[PDB]
Design a protein around this ligand. Structure first.
Ligand SMILES: [Ca+2]
Ligand code: NA
Length: 126
């Protein structure tokens, strides 16, 4: 549940997504459109996690939400990270939001409401 690179998803649903280069020679996911989602099979939150942090970039004219659901694309919604513009598609920063205390192993789904670039995300226990 610690740190997960979004380019290393197990599956996804989209007709636009592509693996892009992120700042500092890193890799990530871009060309996301409303409705798309990334799937990360069997993530183990262990004893629990109540925080979500993601390194994202956005040069959009409107904010984008990243819903965090478990089990399926419509699964339990444990949190939603709203990503306001960061001034550019290559202006990456870490944004955090809380999530309902989640424990054990689950299949993680990230559902997007629009375009945003995402490098990696982390689950912690604040
Ligand atoms: Ca990455
Ligand atoms: Na995008």
């Amino acid at each position: 549940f610690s740190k997960i690179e979004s380019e290393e998803y197990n599956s996804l649903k989209s007709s636009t997504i592509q693996t892009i280069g992120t700042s500092d020679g890193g890799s990530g996911i871009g060309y996301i459109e409303s409705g798309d989602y990334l799937v990360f099979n069997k993530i183990n939150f262990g004893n629990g996690a109540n925080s979500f942090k993601a390194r994202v970039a956005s040069g959009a004219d409107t904010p984008t939400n990243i819903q965090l659901r478990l089990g399926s694309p419509t699964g339990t919604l444990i949190g939603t990270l709203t990503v306001a513009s960061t001034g550019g598609w290559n202006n990456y920063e870490e944004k955090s939001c809380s999530i309902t205390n989640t424990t054990g192993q689950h299949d993680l789904y990230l559902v997007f409401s629009g375009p945003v670039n995402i490098d990696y995300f982390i689950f912690d226990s604040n």
